[PDB]
Automatic annotation (TrEMBL), chains B, C:
GO function terms (MF aspect): endopeptidase inhibitor activity
Residues of the full protein shown: 27 to 208 of 220
Protein name (database record): 21 kDa seed protein-like
Lineage: Eukaryota, Viridiplantae, Streptophyta, Embryophyta, Tracheophyta
Record gene name: LOC111287814
Disulfide bonds: C43-C90, C142-C153, C146-C149
Family: Belongs to the protease inhibitor I3 (leguminous Kunitz-type inhibitor) family.
UniProt keyword terms in alphabetical order: Signal
Amino acid sequence: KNEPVLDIDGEELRAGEQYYVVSAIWGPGGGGLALGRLTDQKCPEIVVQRRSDSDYGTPVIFHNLDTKDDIVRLSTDFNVEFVPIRDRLCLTSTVWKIDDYDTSTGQWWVTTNGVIGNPGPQTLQSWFKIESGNLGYKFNFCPSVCESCITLCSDIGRYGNDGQMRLALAESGWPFVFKKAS
Amino acid sequence: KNEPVLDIDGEELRAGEQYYVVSAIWGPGGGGLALGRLTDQKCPEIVVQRRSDSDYGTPVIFHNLDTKDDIVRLSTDFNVEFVPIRDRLCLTSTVWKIDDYDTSTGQWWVTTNGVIGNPGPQTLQSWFKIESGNLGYKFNFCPSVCESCITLCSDIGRYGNDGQMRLALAESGWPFVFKKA
Amino acid sequence: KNEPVLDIDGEELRAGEQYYVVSAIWGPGGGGLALGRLTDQKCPEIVVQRRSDSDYGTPVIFHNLDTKDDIVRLSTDFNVEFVPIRDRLCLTSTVWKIDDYDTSTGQWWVTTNGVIGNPGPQTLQSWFKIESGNLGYKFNFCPSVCESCITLCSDIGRYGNDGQMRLALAESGWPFVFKKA
């Protein structure tokens, strides 16, 4: 019964529909998110952002906890799934999942090879939330799918990693907006 | 009088029972089968494979030809239905059917909006077999409900399309196993 | 200049790197390869497979033909050496080598006590190739290090042997994948 997420058109987000995730801050805040690849890892891909603010990157589909509700709502666990237009360099999934700890960088990366559905301990790292706290719109990884589980619980922001703007768990979240692909 | 189809626990598949159909090839081979959709088509949904080795996708149920036989057995026509709860179905069934020839890709696709029961020409595109082949079980479309009919016949393999892994008719079938739900 | 062999991570296999070699078929396909010992023979250790698909086994390292090309490539001869992080139970090597003909089983076993390097007649039994079919990858024994020599040329598969999953020459090769250690 939560408040709907809204795209730039004022329209409430629909699960299954494709949306560009674009920086709410343009200029040096960059453009949209898309799939990139690391130098020491060709697969699975990683969530990156384009330097150009005219680039909206790769759209995503949101998969609900209970898909009986087709409205994407705030502070609710869901799966974010990149839906690329290019051919797949990788045979692993393009679903967002929280990586394990990166001892070389000190940040929890947001990466691919996540899971659609199966809420519970097996998929704890595949569930994300959208909020609007002190930002335009932010991603928060704090899955409530498993009440006996212990999970990380914090905002999701951007950090520089080897020439790419990557997404990592951060205290100071980063603001986004949603755009119907059409 | 054929031999039954077994699941991961060694227990034969039951018609009416729920089973995850998971690729016997892990890693790059992806995992279980589930339901997806195309950019230009919202319904009926399409049969896809989740790419992660830790998600089994969507469970299925088997309907035998004879509704009285409870055992799922090899080299015999059956109905396969997904059993999801997504309310994004535009009332189309969850039963596997063979699509008509896709002129764009040159492949015969596997889809939904098939029919349970009613063996005959009407449900021709909805009847599937499981063959052992060489690896774990492979799916095969070769309906035997209409002797008078001209149907395609070949194994079922996997092929890429629109950023999703899909099921099509081919000679080299793709292997799968079954995990009880 | 052949295409590089790729591990699970999408990475071309590098000569010298520890890799786990694990069945590309999970479930009853078992797991990884390791050093085992037979009932009547303690040395040399043989190549075996752990029944649990969770046991990646013993890491190994590749040894190319030309000691300077670091890219492990397809259809190219190489030595293979087990890397037991366990204490070495024997004085013979961990290098893969085709055992002599087993009159009791009609199987050309894969054992150890092979030799790294010295291509030609002296080490013909330690030179293996990697290829791919419909599965991830399949081993093949068809060394080219001696043109005037006659050797068997066939794929490599798995067989039971006193309750241990050994490896031997076959016409259909078993599928594997490589995970960085």
